[PDB]
Amino acid sequence: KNIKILVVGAGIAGPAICYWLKRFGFSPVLIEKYASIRKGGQALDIRGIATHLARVMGIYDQICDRRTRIECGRFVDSAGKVLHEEHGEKFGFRQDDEVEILRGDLVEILMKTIADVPCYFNKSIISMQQNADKVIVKFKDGKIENYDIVIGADGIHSATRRMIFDKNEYQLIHLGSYLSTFTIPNYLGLSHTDLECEANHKLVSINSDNNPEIARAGFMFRSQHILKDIRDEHEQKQFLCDTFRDFGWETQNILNRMPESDDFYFDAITQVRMNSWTKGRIALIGDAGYCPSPLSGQGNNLAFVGAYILAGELKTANANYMQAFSRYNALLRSFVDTNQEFGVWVSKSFLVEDEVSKEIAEERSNRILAMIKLVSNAIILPQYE
Ligand SMILES: Cc1cc2nc3c(=O)[nH]c(=O)nc-3n(C[C@H](O)[C@H](O)[C@H](O)COP(=O)(O)OP(=O)(O)OC[C@H]3O[C@@H](n4cnc5c(N)ncnc54)[C@H](O)[C@@H]3O)c2cc1C
């Protein structure tokens, strides 16, 4: 209304809740720690109830226009021999409403829906304090600003969570694996083709799709090693290179091109476990509160649903945040649990055994496809108008 609402983080959840807040009569302000919007990341899937929300948000056609268009998927051994080849569907469309899109393309689409929302980059909070009346936010500039409501949308490593919640109110559960992805020059000359090689509890992929000049690389692997500083990019890259030192295939050609990449991403595959996602005038959304991990395939869809419900409950409560936050926690809990359980289930076998029976792999793959459809629909959305 006139309420001062700060949204921390311009990823998926933060821009999404800004759209809903703006639509529902509020005037949010958005901040991003980085200098500009971060567009790295693998393809993600808009699935289940999130496809309905994308439609209501007015972005479904735009997402469809930016769908991935891989025509040929090959699984190869470390010498490059093709073990199995899959081909895409006609027109690059599924028969259902699901759509695969690069994360960066989705983030661009979301930011276009909130052109009327102030967004400040290079803004980083160093201190947060709240009383019964205001949230006091001190920035690295030295600025100090008071807000009625602060929404943490700042990802699995949420600074907002760290500054507001006691360490015993949240756990980061490592699921035993890591993910890295980045773009490099398309030195193989791939054309709408994805190559993937799996060995020794490790997976390496490389594709080129809609930009013929660039290729996107992906690395996933099991490891119990924990970094000294999970945010230290030098340590991340050294760990990635050590891990794949003897993998062979294209791994050295890819890793040797990381200095030419402007969108490097690396993170542990982890869940955020909390009994409540709010404290006083502070609410967490998306990965900051309930990251289901990349192995769920659902982080962006949980972010969509969380943004919608929190914004709606704030509208229904006529800006009475205590009531809205209570409803938010209650209405989202079952859906978060279902999606997190599915991520845990996938983690129990992902890359765990070097060689798996074909019969076993096929039954596992079929069950996962059935389960993810159920999980993605496991909520009844409230209506807010
Ligand atoms: C660059 C990038 C690439 C990713 N690639 C993948 C991928 O390939 N696969 C996958 O499964 N998940 C990936 N993720 C995570 C994925 O986006 C989430 O799992 C989910 O889809 C969206 O959750 P989110 O918006 O809550 O968090 P995020 O997408 O992580 O967005 C958090 C945002 O908050 C910003 N931020 C962080 N700290 C602060 C701070 N202190 N102050 C202000 N802003 C801050 C970040 O810069 C970012 O823009 C990626 C995230 C990022 C940021």
Author numbering: 3 to 387
Article passage:
Type 2 TDases have thus far been predominantly identified through soil functional metagenomics with one sequence found in the soil-derived human pathogen Legionella longbeachae.
Tet(56-2) and Tet(56-3) were also identified in the genomes of Legionella species: L. clemsonensis and L. massiliensis, respectively. Additionally, we observed that the loop containing F95 shows a distinct conformation in the Tet(56-2) structure, in which F95 is oriented away from the substrate-binding channel, thus presenting the loop with an opening for substrate to enter the active site. While the apparent catalytic efficiencies (kapp/KM) of Tet(56-2) and Tet(56-3) are similar to Tet(50) for the inactivation of tetracycline and doxycycline, the KM and kapp for the inactivation of doxycycline by Tet(56-2) are 150 ± 42 µM and 3.2 ± 0.2 min−1 respectively. This is much larger than that of Tet(50) (KM and kapp values of 3.57 ± 0.44 μM and 0.15 ± 0.02 min−1 respectively), suggesting that while Tet(56-2) has a much lower binding affinity for doxycycline, the turnover rate is higher. The addition of 1 μg/mL anhydrotetracycline reduced the concentration of tetracycline required to inhibit the growth of Tet(56-2) producing E. coli two-fold, from 32 μg/mL to 16 μg/mL.
